[PDB]
Design a protein around this ligand. Structure first.
Ligand SMILES: CCCCCCCC/C=C/CCCCCCCC(=O)O[C@@H](COC(=O)CCCCCCCCCCCCCCC)COP(=O)([O-])OCC[N+](C)(C)C
Ligand SMILES: CCCCCCCC(=O)OC[C@H](COP(=O)(O)O[C@@H]1[C@H](O)[C@H](O)[C@@H](OP(=O)(O)O)[C@H](OP(=O)(O)O)[C@H]1O)OC(=O)CCCCCCC
Ligand SMILES: *[C@@H]1O[C@H](CO)[C@@H](O[C@@H]2O[C@H](CO)[C@@H](O[C@@H]3O[C@H](CO)[C@@H](O)[C@H](O)[C@@H]3O)[C@H](O)[C@H]2NC(C)=O)[C@H](O)[C@H]1NC(C)=O
Ligand SMILES: CCCCCCCCCCCC
Ligand SMILES: CCCCCCCCCCCC
Ligand SMILES: CCCCCCCC
Ligand SMILES: CCCCCCCC
Ligand SMILES: CCCCCCCC
Ligand SMILES: CCCCCCCC
Ligand SMILES: CCCCCCCC
Ligand SMILES: CCCCCCCC
Lengths: 119, 77
């Protein structure tokens, strides 16, 4: 996942109930790489957003075709969001991947609502 | 997890390009689909030159890709 950037050492006297203890700590600095996450999460979400986009070029008269494309897009977007969040731990705050999937939700849902108001 | 794309990823990506291009091709045909009603046994929509050409272009190009991919990877030292 990460790349080892470097190491750094510290030596500090921590105070606790049993006494004062000298603690020596090694910080390894790790920087994440997103290539697997791009081919894993970001690329599929961009491709499904393009799938939402292609609905506009489909003729408006094709009600089942438009509706089917929109529903398949938004529902598989929900599934992709679920698996992407499964990759993460159980933490209560929105992350950058969560922001991207939320924006993708907005796009696909907006395309479906665009055909809803167009019809 | 790995910071690189395996050969499986390349084959999957090319197949993804093929299916996405099939969708794009249908959208291209749909742009020129002037009439909604189909042929009845008054004009009727002739089969698109896009479709007629794609029926050969897609499988043939996909087979050429299969040849290139399998020849490249199977014989590697
Ligand atoms: C999983 C497999 C599924 C099995 C399915 C079972 C089927 C088995 C195969 C069935 C044979 C397919 C032809 C049957 C149709 C005959 C009529 C026709 O429509 O032909 C059309 C030509 O378009 C084609 O025929 C292209 C068909 C695929 C060939 C593409 C090359 C790649 C080969 C793949 C290898 C990979 C590449 C390897 C390269 C290294 C012409 O249209 P038309 O309107 O008829 O034209 C007017 C009439 N006329 C022709 C009389 C003038
Ligand atoms: C990505 C952006 C898109 C770029 C793709 C660009 C590809 C592209 O979109 O071109 C389509 C165009 C017309 O193709 P297509 O058959 O679909 O459209 C026909 C065309 O409009 C005729 O002029 C129409 O007759 P008319 O005069 O109105 O009376 C006819 O109507 P009808 O008689 O049936 O009733 C229409 O069906 O050119 C080609 O012939 C195929 C080129 C090779 C395509 C091979 C591509 C693999
Ligand atoms: C890992 O920990 C060690 C020890 O805490 C760090 O080495 C220490 O670094 C300091 C500052 O660079 C050194 O002090 C300086 O020494 C030079 C050379 O004698 C002198 O010219 C300066 O005026 C200053 O006194 C200290 O000597 C050095 N420790 C030893 C035993 O030599 C080290 O930097 C840590 N590694 C990291 C942070 O990556
Ligand atoms: C999940 C792996 C997908 C990698 C990217 C595929 C790109 C091909 C589709 C777009 C071309 C039309
Ligand atoms: C008919 C156009 C198909 C485009 C999808 C395939 C993309 C890769 C090119 C072929 C590699 C040998
Ligand atoms: C790496 C995911 C974003 C790719 C850019 C797509 C812009 C349409
Ligand atoms: C995806 C770009 C092709 C559509 C632009 C031409 C239609 C007016
Ligand atoms: C309440 C879901 C969206 C409804 C939009 C329909 C078109 C105005
Ligand atoms: C993804 C859209 C492909 C182009 C459709 C319109 C034809 C120029
Ligand atoms: C369409 C069938 C392809 C067979 C390739 C031969 C090697 C398995
Ligand atoms: C139809 C072409 C399939 C290729 C089979 C693998 C060749 C080594």
């Amino acid at each position: 996942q990460f790349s080892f950037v470097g190491l750094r050492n510290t030596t500090e006297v921590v105070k606790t109930t049993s006494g004062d203890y000298v603690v020596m700590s090694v910080y390894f600095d790790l920087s994440r790489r997103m290539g697997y996450f791009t081919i894993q999460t970001y690329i599929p979400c961009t491709l499904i957003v393009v799938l939402s986009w292609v609905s506009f070029w489909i003729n408006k008269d094709a009600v089942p075709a438009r509706t089917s494309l929109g529903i398949t897009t938004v529902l598989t977007m929900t599934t992709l969001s679920t698996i992407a969040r499964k990759s993460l731990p159980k933490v209560s705050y929105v992350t950058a991947m969560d922001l991207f999937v939320s924006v993708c939700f907005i796009f696909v849902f907006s395309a479906l609502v665009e055909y809803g108001t167009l019809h | 997890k790995v910071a690189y794309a395996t050969a499986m990823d390349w084959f999957i990506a090319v197949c993804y390009a093929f299916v996405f291009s099939a969708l794009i091709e249908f959208a291209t045909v749909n742009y020129f689909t002037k009439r909604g009603y189909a042929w009845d046994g008054k004009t009727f929509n002739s089969v698109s030159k896009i479709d007629r050409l794609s029926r050969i272009a897609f499988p043939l190009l996909f087979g050429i890709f299969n040849l290139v991919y399998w020849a490249t990877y199977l014989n590697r030292e």
